[model samples]
Target: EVETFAFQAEIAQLMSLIINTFYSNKEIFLRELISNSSDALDKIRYESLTDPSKLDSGKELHINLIPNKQDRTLTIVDTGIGMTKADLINNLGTIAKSGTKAFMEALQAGADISMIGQFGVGFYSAYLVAEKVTVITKHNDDEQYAWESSAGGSFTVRTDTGEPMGRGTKVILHLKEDQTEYLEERRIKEIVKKHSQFIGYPITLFVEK
Candidate 1:
């Protein structure tokens, strides 16, 4: 029910590539994550058209952004189609362009990284501001699971049935010290306005009242 997997060695170099660009292109992480959720929401809605049961009852197509200033954490939870264990494993842990080699080649050619979204490596952008990231997800046909990584040489994915029984995925980012600006509403709004102003789903930022 629990296991840890070592990352493919190529990810070490790939990790270096993204880390080098972190501060220069800091906000893509948010954009990439929300865009990821939009696609998931799209798939579930389209698929549920044929089989209503595919969507968990009462979970709307929504994306919620929450910043915890005291804890130095940020969260993006989407009520969308969730991922299977293998999907989560490969999705965040490795590049799918015939291995990280071709993935590096494409970036070497200067293709904008949004292009990588086509293959799902876009999720790693989260490492930009977070020291470690944790993902808790549940799917309609798979048992609930969680993935945790520090963008290092390995990651862990284990059964986490303790997660709420929701057919969606939630990602939590534990911020690095200097990246605390990400835990404030003003900064979040600026990034959202510039990058995701016209995104499709309802992306809401929770404000503590």
Candidate 2:
């Protein structure tokens, strides 16, 4: 069953602010996302200590960046523990728990809120330069699913009936016009090295031969 819902009001307003204020310095979107993937990997690896089976038996932990200028899309794939339906709704659909309340308090206090640190709200940062975002993910505990949004207040999640992702998440960003700089190999390398150099897993960037 596919589910669609609006972002929590605080999240919606924060997204609008992020897009408008940081459009020029938006390359951090890639950094935040890559960091998310690394964190996901870390979560599962730590979980595996108690339950060895928590890690996917077949998939190796890593991250892949595929930039397609022809299609104007950049796909980031990670072999990490993917989210379940409930997780998808809670993590990506809305700002859950005290994080939202704390963010509101910080905003009201005229404090600078780092959305990424505050709520893992970095996912929506993709909209800074992408018209649409598509996420395909699979968790051993649940079936593969697809979540999509345009950062226009609402998002939808449905079972992904296509090929299995083995065990991981894949995010595709439909680059906005004039934001093709992200699609360039040099730019991606620069960003990854600068921000993701210390990441535990290897991050591979693809380019045309």
Candidate 3:
């Protein structure tokens, strides 16, 4: 029996973006997240032209794909300019509204972070593999903040000490127990070579063999 519940336009868009559009191939989340890392690095590199202090001294641009085999989590860590609390709320929250416009709001308010490269939709692709997602982000202009969501429609943000994170964004996809293939460095290597090979930043997979 075919069953369906009426979803609003926003929810429909999300469902279409995921299941109908980018469905089945879960490995693409790896590609998308790495692309997101590239987007972050792209902006910070551009911003650093005027403000070199935005980047950490002597730290090369890189992205880390850290998979906790024991904890069953994959964190996409980027060494790039992150977001303020206001930016965090709207950044991940505005997928329905489209990422570029929400980011334009930030730009209008004088934030240097550029809104580009298929962002909001790509970030939410984490949900296809993760049941719960946590974003621990830090920025030079802002202290620190954490944003979490199980899927969509609702999310929570909390203040942090700003000690652990120096600068950049960490999107932690708490992978479901069944979706453990991403925990292997070899699998990640395959996916990176498949889709994310051209990303400008170096992608490091720090997973135990």
Candidate 4:
């Protein structure tokens, strides 16, 4: 059964701030997403160290960025620790549960900023360039599922009957009309190189001839 839930108070506020005033430098969306992918991959790799069987032995861990100009979508897929149904609700459903509100409050109080991407609100940044965002993921311990939102105060989650992702997550962003610049392979490469070159996993860009 599909589930729909309203965003938490702090999360609703966070989305409002990003969707309304944070579109100026939308390139950061890719950076934030890539950072999240890297973190997910790191987690599974760490767990596998203790129990080798925890890793997906058949698939290599990597991240792929595919831009479809025909569909005006940018998708980022990773072979990492996918989320379970409960994980989806808890991880993405709640706001400030990840300390995002504290981080934002500190910044608003004029605290010297020591870091930029430490907050969990980075996921919502995708709305800066995409009108809709969808996450398709599969976890070893859970069935495949899809989570979707339009940067509003509510999101929906449902079981996905599509192809299994093995063990990872794929984030699809439906690019906004004016944000089509992100569909260019050159632009994606530039953004990845600038903000994600040092990422631990292999980051691949799908380019067409």
Candidate 5:
């Protein structure tokens, strides 16, 4: 696999914008995440065709969105290839593609990075309604790690919490008060079906009774 690294400064800022405000429709957040999960599943599945042991033992590919009304949080979990601490910083902090030097050159040359969605920078959209974001990721090549950020110009990545959920990624979003619309079961499902119905992964949900 290719080595992981952080995005360039200008590139990171552009990524922040896309993550925090690319879609005016608030509900598309679920669609973006699920679409990413679907892409992850697709990637691993394709890789498995060549490398059968590419994924962890018995870790079927899937995505789950569980809402916690009390905490006003939405937790999205995926049984996809996880990320490392470096991977988190490099991938989450900087541009998804292009290096620091190259990104800077492009920016200096007047090219905008908003076009990076082509390179899969969609994951950062979690910052749209989330005041705080935490990602617990597990990879077959390394131990699980948790990546946390507030989209406040910096982020942190460390070892996972005591409860690691096997080989996959778990993103916990602390919702903003104004964005509580995501907390509703029906609303969440509707958004999923609208933008990500054919995303190529099975997405389920957990709701409060």
Candidate 6:
């Protein structure tokens, strides 16, 4: 079967160059991802009050950082709108869906990113340091799906047969060998405090230290 999605050959090459050379730091990737999640959670919380069914999922919305060095896994979970199969493919390999135009409008409007959501491909930045990534999600309006990819030409999406999160989604990162610095508690804490501390929601680290 043909791949339901494939990165534009140019985008693939462009992202590779950006990740490899243009961006000088890796911590920025974490910052972007966490901020994206924070915005996503905020979106659901606001939408929930307008539509009671939207709050059917867990309301204890928070971002948790779990670092498993032994397994080399770093998981970030958020109680935000989860994705279905269609969302997986369209979101994973597509670009226009991110509201790039609106993002530029915000910038033009002198918006300092003090507020935003789904405005761009900040989520995909997770692939910067992850060798492989998995997204597990459950939505009140649709069946759950699991999407996996290695930042290559193709990605796989299928229904997750197991228990879907009663609310929200989780993105698990299998950290690349050189990106293990993210697994450090102190490092994560610092990042949260810096860029995310002022966030109106809770951001915490789940660790066994």
lDDT of 3: 0.70
lDDT per residue (tens digit) for residues 62-121 in model 3: 998888887889999997778788776554444545654554455458643212234365
Q: How many Å off is the CA of 196 in candidate 3?
A: 0.7
Give the per-residue lDDT digits (tens) of candidate 5, residues 80-191.
8767665776544444544434544554687554333334555666767788887788877878787776665666666765686777788899998988889899988888
Which candidate model has the greater lDDT, 4 or 5? 4
Tens-digit per-residue lDDT, 108-203, candidate 2: 687553444555566767877788899999888898999988876888999999877888899999999989999999999999988779998989
Q: lDDT values of the candidates?
A: 0.79, 0.80, 0.70, 0.82, 0.70, 0.70
RMSD of each: 2.4, 2.5, 9.2, 2.3, 5.2, 4.7
| Alpha-carbon runs more than 4 Å astray in model 6 | 1-4, 91-119
For each candidate in turn, the TM-score is 0.88, 0.87, 0.78, 0.91, 0.79, 0.80
Candidate 5 achieves a global lDDT of: 0.70
- Tell me the spans in candidate 2 whose CA falls farther than 4 Å from its real position: 56-59, 91-115
lDDT of 6 by residue, 30-148 (tens): 77778767877887888888887777567688888889999898888888766666666664446543444455466468743322334565666676678888888887777777777
- In terms of lDDT, model 4 sits at 0.82
Local error of candidate 5 at residue 65 (angstroms): 0.8
Could you tell which candidate, 1 or 5, scores higher by TM-score? 1
Error of 6 at 88 (Å): 1.9
**Over the full model, what C-alpha lDDT does candidate 1 score relative to the true structure?**
0.79
Tell me the TM-score of model 3.
0.78
**What is the lDDT for 206 in model 6?**
88
Best by TM-score: 4
Residue 114, candidate 4: Cα error in Å is 12
Can you tell me which runs of candidate 1 are displaced by over 4 Å?
A: 21-23, 90-99, 111-119, 161-165
- Reference-based lDDT, residue 149, model 3: 67
